[PDB]
Design a protein around this ligand. Structure first.
Ligand code: BCB
Ligand code: BCB
Ligand code: BCB
Ligand SMILES: C/C=C1/c2cc3[nH]c4c(c3C)C(=O)[C@H](C(=O)OC)c4c3nc(cc4[nH]c(cc(n2)[C@@H]1C)c(C(C)=O)c4C)[C@@H](C)[C@@H]3CCC(=O)OC/C=C(\C)CCC[C@H](C)CCC[C@H](C)CCCC(C)C
Ligand SMILES: C/C=C1/c2cc3[nH]c4c(c3C)C(=O)[C@H](C(=O)OC)c4c3nc(cc4[nH]c(cc(n2)[C@@H]1C)c(C(C)=O)c4C)[C@@H](C)[C@@H]3CCC(=O)OC/C=C(\C)CCC[C@H](C)CCC[C@H](C)CCCC(C)C
Ligand SMILES: CC(C)=CCC/C(C)=C/CC/C(C)=C\CC/C(C)=C/CC/C(C)=C/CC/C(C)=C/CC/C(C)=C/CC/C(C)=C/CC/C(C)=C/CC1=C(C)C(=O)c2ccccc2C1=O
Ligand SMILES: CCCCCCCCCCCCCCCCCC(=O)OC[C@H](CO)OC(=O)CCCCCCCCCCCCCCCCC
Ligand code: HEC
Ligand code: HEC
Ligand SMILES: CC(C)=CCC/C(C)=C/C=C/C(C)=C/C=C/C(C)=C/C=C\C=C(C)\C=C\C=C(/C)CC/C=C(\C)CCCC(C)C
Ligand SMILES: CCCCCCCCCCCC[N+](C)(C)[O-]
Ligand SMILES: CCCCCCCCCCCC[N+](C)(C)[O-]
Ligand SMILES: CCCCCCCCCCCC[N+](C)(C)[O-]
Ligand SMILES: CCCCCCCCCCCC[N+](C)(C)[O-]
Ligand SMILES: CCCCCCCCCCCC[N+](C)(C)[O-]
Ligand SMILES: [Fe+2]
Lengths: 323, 273, 334, 258
């Protein structure tokens, strides 16, 4: 076996590299340090990190959201520290329970949730500027920022665009470990089973597809590490036996193949489409479809099954039934 | 026809079984003994699905459903129209998948490359076995397995989850999901990074390994490196199922209550109750 | 941490839908042993002599019974409600007609309630029926009751920790969670859905597309309604020691016909029965109970599914005393 | 009325379904599958029938060429016509077009099958500031082996027959990635040096084990043009030689494993 594909047998140390960007070279802080154990499975060097205005702003906005959430969670256990620690996963900051439509809810019934959302959205946007700007500073394309933009848009769909489109803040995702999970079920129930939403299916197909492709691509590159396949940039500009063998493995297996550059396009596209699909699904939900299962029945797609125990009429529909 | 660089690689050898007998290509496809077995299992399985569907109520592709037996058949053979088709198809499916994996080994050997891809492919095959074979064996019936139907298999997933009240609180599920999400995110990051270096835009120069590392070191304070991101991706993807399998196997054989209540191990400690 | 195999499993839907019960043999056995404490029917007595409406002074419900039949009922009621305390729990030992002790008048109303369950709610209780034991299980305070705020322990025979106590505000989220099968759902489904008939449990639309005039802004039910129904369903599930598939095919929770089991319809009738019990029999008892029995808003303890079922899909695994004590119903009209 | 309902029994989500599939297939087929053909195309046909007459489909499946501007000068355009000139020391095992080929000589030396290399540029891979990227420690004097790891210099290299093939004299480090890629050894009984990729080395405290080739086969490892630098094509030649051994070190290795 190629032991290098499992871990680095003999680690190298040398002087730290710094690539100059168009701006911000003076905003790198930290002194790099090295972990021997990390170095077995990754680069041993940690830090330095770039500061800059957009990252500082992201931390300020994000910390403010985090503090609003934590302070409301703490109120939920009457500020008792032991109960806060115990009950943490069950605690949350909730959107309005009452229906105010699009009215700004009062602080005690959704207003703090809304504030936390705003500060979170500002944090995300601020981090996006960093991800975008840093690429431009280093003379790189902005592929990562466009992928991140789709992730952010999805979060905006579930946090505030869907709520605006149906006209109720009650529909937003709560902040909290278990509470944000509980929302998934409430939302799926309200909209007639998310398994029957085609865009849920598309998003899954792409997400599972990212599993397949990263397993396939990661494994492919390790399989050709003996030929320097991991040096992907110069394999793109000057095809080597590594990527000739990678391509032929696939061609011979599945009947077609990518190139070392284009496989990264497939992976970027699959990852982007998880979020684009999910977002379309959410934008259509409540707006244009009320019950996904019934929409599938209407269009002739839903499976049907025999009764196992006797079929059961709705008792509310029976003669003389109470309300 | 061949890729312009392909002919030099089209040598004899590398087989696991069969030697020269099946060591040849059909168009772009390598055959080998396991290509022959794959085709046999695919043909039989797909034929059986066609026949099973022809005996059911619909030809709609989303609605067709080929189902396992009633629980009462236990681990025995079921009549064809009462779960026996499902049993036969399952055997064909595993024969096809395993043949596919071993064919990839032969192809890897012929090319002189590592066997990492078929090893990675063992992971989804293993998960299929967890769902359809191991868990049903532990519960005592084939009828606990999932049905073959585009939408029907989702009805099974749905009910199985709700059998444990809220499957989201399953700790093996929580791990599996986290791996699914971080893997999708990482694939995006890795693809975009490589494309950003090779495609800076505007007649600018292609950048370098040093630029790749500098980008993440600047954005998050660490760069894992060019080889290691591939090891990481394989690890994250594989662990979607290597960790999820524990959550699947636990549900029924090792835990019969709702999943949220499992967390009582933490919530109900006397010190803070 | 875990439950050792084998699991008992049942099938409740078409093959390949993963519908059915999932049960731990040791838990089933412990619940059967608890429920097996139900005292046996007392020996039959010959009906002879006049009705006790003519023999006794203050009989208003069980007046048709003969003396021996009526004293058999009193013996049974004593076994089921106050065996530790005895006849004098309800009675002045020197005047059995006296209503001076508050349990006498409550007991008379409970006799009416039990007769009403067994006569008017056969759509739920069938010919299994209920006795005083079904709820009380040998104590004057039934072990599983609800107030207008969540309370812990669920079983009031267990000593509460300080944090479990309703006065300890820091414990509220846990009181809620342990009523909804450990979920974090931030709703009390007892006060929302079972204490009265004000709220609709159904939350899913009955058409594919959103109807214009109910689907925008303040026209809409808030999403909180769906979380609250989910909370009720977690609570019912845990109350009966079962899961969603005992009643539903999760393909479509909202559908009946082949998409629901006969148990779902029985559950529907149970919700109506429980609301009748609470609004019309149990809640009004706050005027007849001492302040020490009442919750913090002055409410009488009331019933939920668990009050009878106690973690079993049929209370007491389907044990019945209906033919043994016909005086508890069904009562022939009128 | 219903939100989303349109004329002719249609609804908005239903139209979006068709549109999403259209977008997916368009991107997959028209964009990605053509990006996939920037290397190796057009396909090569047996005998020839070459061109002469390039089929319409040979044009349709290709994207327009793209040009990379290289970091250290020059450009690279793909797809482009890339002849494979070098006569192959392979012969047909059978007349049918999918039959495999077999080596006519020593396949490690002739560089066929898994001993094949690509016609990479005969240029030294460069660091971001234009120094030679992959160099021995005798040149990269600011690099070192991490504390805790085996220093392989002086250790014997032990080949697949368990015979000692030579002695490790240096390590070659990638100065851009900070990562060792080759060991350099003096070859016993030959008067030469040879590189070996670390992926073919099992590094032990007392020896380097190499199962890919037999001891006698180290004599023909491809030789570098210069002592202290390596070209991208030489890297391909060196790695390919050891990979050849996996199939060809003994006659048994090409034959069925089981
Ligand atoms: C424990 C949970 C499970 C699960 C949960 C799940 C969910 C929740 C959803 C899917 C969805 C999908 N599932 Mg399922 N599923 C599928 C296949 C499928 C597809 C019909 C679809 C898209 C998958 C995709 O793109 O993946 C990544 C792979 C890619 C992109 C490569 C292409 C794969 C190709 C589309 C597979 C097509 C399969 C054929 C229709 C099957 C028949 C093959 C024969 C007859 C030729 C297979 C073949 C299996 C097997 C063999 O085990 C499987 C098991 C499971 N699924 C488990 C039971 N699946 C989604 C869907 O839309 O369902 C309708 C969806 O929402
Ligand atoms: C009972 C309920 C269920 C449910 C309900 C559900 C809902 C309601 C939704 C999904 C959605 C999705 N579901 Mg589904 N689902 C899925 C899979 C998936 C995902 C592929 C998909 C998109 C979500 C995503 O990637 O979020 C992970 C990624 C996120 C959230 C992006 C984050 C990006 C962000 C920039 C990160 C920022 C981090 C900052 C540091 C945070 C700062 C913090 C603050 C405090 C400062 C599977 C595979 C299954 C199976 C196997 O059964 C399943 C079953 C179910 N789902 C049930 C049917 N699902 C979504 C969808 O597609 O709808 C159509 C969706 O909205
Ligand atoms: C209401 C019920 C729910 C549910 C129930 C559920 C169950 C019951 C299970 C999962 C499982 C899983 N869930 Mg969950 N889930 C998931 C995510 C996931 C997955 C990460 C994970 C593993 C899936 C799997 O086994 O694939 C399996 C895929 C396989 C086996 C693919 C096999 C491929 C094969 C080898 C090759 C096939 C070839 C084709 C036939 C070829 C076709 C030919 C063509 C292409 C030429 C998300 C992200 C969400 C969200 C967002 O809410 C969600 C919600 C829900 N889950 C609900 C709460 N989930 C599983 C898990 O791990 O739980 C811990 C599981 O058992
Ligand atoms: C399908 C494609 C997907 C996808 C894609 C992409 N996702 C990206 C990018 C792309 C392309 C980026 O370019 C960007 C990034 O930079 O990557 C390195 C990023 C992000 N994805 C995050 C998390 C996440 N993605 C999820 C999902 C998906 N993503 C889906 C699956 C999920 C879940 C729930 O699934 C989670 C939790 C953060 C790590 C990060 C945003 C930080 C932020 O907006 O902070 C804003 C808030 C703060 C800076 C303050 C609070 C600090 C928090 C607690 C911690 C922040 C850590 C940060 C890295 C700081 C490090 C420096 C520190 C050591 C000193
Ligand atoms: C954790 C890591 C993961 C991972 C990894 C990897 N994945 C790989 C590889 C690696 C490394 C390969 O090397 C191999 C390959 O070549 O890739 C191009 C492969 C492949 N992953 C496939 C599908 C896939 N991967 C999924 C998941 C993951 N992949 C996870 C995420 C999922 C889902 C659902 O999630 C799906 C659907 C095929 C495209 C391909 C197998 C072809 C096959 O085996 O051919 C042989 C078999 C056939 C061509 C047809 C067989 C038909 C049978 C007999 C009859 C049908 C029976 C069936 C049971 C009916 C189901 C009905 C349905 C509605 C319920
Ligand atoms: C009843 C009936 C008629 C039954 C049918 C019987 C039948 C099947 C007959 C066929 C007989 C024939 C024709 C031939 C016999 C020989 C034989 C064994 C043939 C196999 C035929 C067969 C079963 C084909 C199916 C192949 C198959 C499973 C295809 C799936 C393709 C899919 C969906 C892939 C998903 C992953 C994905 C999105 C990939 C796209 C991107 C690619 C191509 C990545 C691969 C790839 C990666 C990952 C790199 O990292 C890389 C790095 C550097 C260079 C290149 C690559 C590269 O190409
Ligand atoms: C996958 C679905 C394959 C179903 C195989 C059923 C064949 C049972 C043989 C006849 C036994 C019977 O009719 O009656 C047997 C009895 C019936 O109740 O139970 C038993 O025979 C116990 C049988 C134990 C079977 C264990 C199988 C080991 C692993 C199989 C891999 C599946 C792929
Ligand atoms: C409360 C749970 C009771 C217990 C314990 C016992 N009895 Fe009772 N008793 C109860 C009620 C509600 C009534 C009136 C019933 C009605 O139909 O209105 C009675 C009545 C009697 C009487 C008749 C008294 C009279 O009117 O003269 C007798 C003789 C009687 N009960 C006896 C009795 C005995 C012997 C008990 C222990 C075995 C006993 N009762 C328990 C309520 C309760
Ligand atoms: C039988 C004892 C049940 C169990 C177990 C579960 N549910 Fe249920 N559900 C039941 C009934 C009788 C009703 C209707 C009540 C009424 O007064 O109309 C319901 C309703 C739902 C709904 C709403 C359906 C609608 O039409 O909008 C949902 C979403 C629902 N139930 C879900 C659900 C879940 C997730 C369960 C397990 C946690 C579950 N139910 C259990 C009866 C029974
Ligand atoms: C009128 C218009 C157009 C807009 C109104 C204003 C506006 C933009 C509102 C936006 C609201 C939004 C986007 C709401 C989104 C809410 C979402 C998606 C919440 C989702 C999940 C939250 C969870 C899991 C939070 C748990 C929080 C805690 C445990 C507290 C601390 C949190 C952390 C340290 C971060 C989690 C760690 C993670 C990286 C693993
Ligand atoms: C991320 C910027 C650098 C942070 C500086 C923090 C210095 C920590 C020094 C401890 C070194 C730990 N070490 C070397 C043993 O791994
Ligand atoms: C969501 C946006 C929030 C506004 C606050 C962020 C301001 C940071 C902008 C810094 C831009 C500096 N620059 C041009 C060098 O990248
Ligand atoms: C993930 C759920 C996917 C459900 C897909 C439903 C699509 C409905 C529209 C097309 C139906 C076509 N038809 C009649 C052939 O089934
Ligand atoms: C639901 C997710 C959709 C994923 C799309 C999958 C794309 C793989 C298609 C490969 C097509 C191969 N070929 C040679 C016919 O172009
Ligand atoms: C919906 C995604 C499924 C795509 C099916 C994959 C296509 C199988 C084709 C194998 C060989 C393809 N081809 C024609 C390029 O050789
Ligand atoms: Fe890569």
């Amino acid at each position: 076996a190629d032991y290098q594909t499992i871990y680095t047998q003999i680690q190298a140390r040398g002087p730290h590299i710094t690539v100059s960007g168009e701006w911000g070279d003076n905003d790198r802080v930290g002194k790099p340090f090295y972990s021997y154990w990390l170095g077995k499975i990754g680069d041993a060097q940690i830090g330095p990190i770039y500061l800059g205005a957009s990252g500082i702003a992201a931390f300020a906005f994000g910390s403010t959201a985090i503090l609003i959430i934590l302070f409301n969670m703490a109120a939920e256990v009457h500020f008792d520290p032991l109960q806060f620690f115990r009950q943490f996963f069950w605690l949350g900051l909730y959107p309005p329970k009452a229906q105010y439509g699009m009215g700004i809810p009062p602080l005690h019934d959704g207003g703090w949730w809304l504030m936390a959302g705003l500060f979170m959205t500002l944090s995300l946007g601020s981090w996006w500027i960093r991800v975008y700007s840093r690429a431009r500073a280093l003379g790189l394309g902005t592929h990562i920022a466009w992928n991140f933009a789709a992730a952010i848009f999805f979060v905006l769909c579930i946090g505030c665009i869907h709520p605006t489109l149906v006209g109720s803040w009650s529909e937003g995702v709560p902040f909290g470990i278990w509470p944000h999970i509980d929302w998934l079920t409430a939302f799926s129930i309200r909209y007639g089973n998310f398994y029957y939403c085609p865009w849920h299916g598309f998003s899954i197909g792409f997400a599972y597809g990212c599993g397949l492709l990263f397993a396939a691509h990661g494994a492919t590159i390790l399989a050709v590490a003996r030929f320097g396949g991991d040096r992907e940039i110069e394999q793109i500009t000057d095809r080597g036996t590594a990527v000739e063998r990678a391509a032929l493995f696939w061609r011979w297996t599945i009947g077609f193949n990518a190139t070392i550059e284009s496989v990264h396009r497939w992976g970027w596209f699959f990852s982007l489409m998880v979020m684009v699909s999910a977002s379309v699904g959410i934008l259509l939900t409540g707006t244009f479809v009320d019950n996904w299962y019934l929409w599938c029945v209407k269009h002739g797609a839903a499976p049907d099954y025999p009764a196992y125990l006797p079929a059961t009429p709705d008792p509310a529909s029976l003669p003389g039934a109470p309300k | 026809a061949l890729l312009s660089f392909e002919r030099k690689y089209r040598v004899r050898g590398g087989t696991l079984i069969g030697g020269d007998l099946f060591d040849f290509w059909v168009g772009p496809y390598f055959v080998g003994f396991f290509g022959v077995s794959a085709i046999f299992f695919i043909f039989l399985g797909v034929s059986l699905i066609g026949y099973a569907a022809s005996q059911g109520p619909t030809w709609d592709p989303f609605a067709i459903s080929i189902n396992p037996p009633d629980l009462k058949y236990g681990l025995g053979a079921a009549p064809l129209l009462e779960g026996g088709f499902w049993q036969a198809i399952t055997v064909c499916a595993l024969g096809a998948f395993i043949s596919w994996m071993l064919r990839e080994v032969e192809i890897s050997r012929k090319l002189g490359i590592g066997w990492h891809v078929p090893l990675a492919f063992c992971v989804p095959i293993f998960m299929f076995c967890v769902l359809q074979v191991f868990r049903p064996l532990l519960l005592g019936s084939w009828g606990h397995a999932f049905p073959y139907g585009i939408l029907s298999h989702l009805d099974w997933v749905n009910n199985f989850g709700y059998q444990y009240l809220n499957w989201h609180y399953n700790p093996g599920h929580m791990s599996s999901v986290s791996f699914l999400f971080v893997n999708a995110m990482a694939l995006g990051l890795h693809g975009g990074l490589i494309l950003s270096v090779a495609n800076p835009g505007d007649g600018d120069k292609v950048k370098t390994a040093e630029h790749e590392n500098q980008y993440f070191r600047d954005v998050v304070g660490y760069s894992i490196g060019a080889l290691s991101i591939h090891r990481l991706g394989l690890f994250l993807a594989s662990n979607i199922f290597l960790t999820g399998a524990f959550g699947t196997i636990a549900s029924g054989p090792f835990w019969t209550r709702g999943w949220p209540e499992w967390w009582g191990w933490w919530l109900d400690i006397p010190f803070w109750s | 941490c875990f439950e050792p195999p084998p699991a008992t499993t049942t099938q409740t839907g078409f093959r390949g839908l993963s519908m059915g019960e999932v049960l731990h043999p040791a838990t089933v056995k412990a619940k059967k042993e608890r429920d097996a404490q139900y005292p046996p029917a007392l020996a039959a007595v010959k009906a002879e002599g006049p009705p006790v409406s003519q023999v006794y002074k203050n009989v208003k419900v069980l007046g048709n019974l003969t003396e021996a039949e009526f004293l058999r009922t009193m013996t049974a009621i004593t076994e089921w409600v106050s065996p530790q305390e005895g006849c004098t729990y309800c009675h002045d030992e020197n005047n059995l007609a006296s209503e001076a002790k508050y349990p006498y008048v409550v007991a008379r109303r409970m006799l009416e309630m039990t007769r009403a369950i067994n006569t008017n709610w056969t759509q739920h209780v069938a010919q299994t029926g209920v006795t005083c034991y079904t709820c009380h299980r040998g104590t004057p305070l039934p072990p599983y009751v609800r107030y207008l705020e969540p309370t812990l322990p669920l079983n009031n025979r267990e000593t509460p920790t300080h944090v479990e106590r309703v006065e300890t505000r820091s414990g509220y989220v846990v009181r809620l969670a342990k009523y909804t099968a450990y979920s974090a759902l931030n709703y009390d489904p007892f006060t929302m859905f079972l204490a009265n008939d004000k709220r609709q449990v159904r939350v899913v639309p009955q058409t594919a597309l959103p109807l214009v005039g109910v689907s925008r802004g303040k026209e809409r039910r808030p999403l909180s309604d769906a979380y609250a129904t989910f909370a009720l369903m977690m609570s019912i599930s845990d109350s009966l020691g079962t899961n969603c598939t005992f009643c539903h095919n999760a393909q479509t929770f909202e559908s009946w016909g082949k998409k629901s089991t006969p148990q779902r319809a029985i559950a529907w009738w149970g919700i109506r029965m429980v609301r009748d019990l609470n609004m019309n029999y149990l809640a009004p008892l706050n005027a007849s109970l001492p302040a020490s029995r009442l919750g913090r808003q002055g409410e009488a303890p009331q019933a939920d599914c668990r009050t009878c079922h106690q973690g079993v899909t049929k209370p007491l695994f389907g044990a019945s005393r209906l033919k043994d004590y016909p005086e508890l119903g069904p009562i022939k009209a009128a | 009325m219903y939100h989303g309902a349109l004329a002719q029994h249609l609804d908005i989500a239903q139209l979006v379904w068709y549109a999403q599939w259209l977008v997916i297939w368009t991107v997959v087929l028209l964009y990605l599958r053509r990006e996939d053909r920037r290397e190796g195309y057009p396909l090569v046909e047996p005998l020839g029938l070459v061109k002469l007459a390039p089929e319409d489909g040979q044009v349709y499946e290709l994207p327009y060429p793209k040009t990379f501007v290289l970091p250290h000068g020059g450009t690279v355009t793909v797809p482009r016509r890339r002849p494979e000139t070098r006569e192959l020391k392979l012969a047909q095992t059978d007349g049918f077009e999918g039959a495999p080929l077999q080596p006519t000589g020593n396949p490690l030396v002739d560089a066929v099958g898994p001993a094949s290399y690509a016609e990479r540029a005969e240029v030294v891979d460069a660091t971001v500031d234009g120094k030679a990227k992959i160099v021995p420690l005798r040149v990269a004097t600011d690099f070192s082996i991490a504390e805790g790891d085996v220093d392989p210099r002086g250790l014997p290299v032990v080949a697949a027959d368990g015979v000692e093939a030579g002695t490790v004299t240096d390590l070659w480090v990638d100065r851009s990635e900070h990562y060792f890629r080759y060991l350099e050894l003096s070859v016993a009984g030959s008067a030469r040096t040879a590189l070996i990729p670390l992926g073919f080395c099992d590094v032990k405290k007392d020896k380097i084990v190499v199962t890919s080739i037999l001891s006698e086969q180290f004599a023909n490892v491809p030789r570098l043009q210069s002592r202290d630098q390596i070209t991208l094509r030489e890297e391909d030649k060196v790695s390919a030689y050891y990979a050849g051994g996996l199939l060809y070190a003994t006659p048994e290795r090409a034959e069925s494993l089981l």
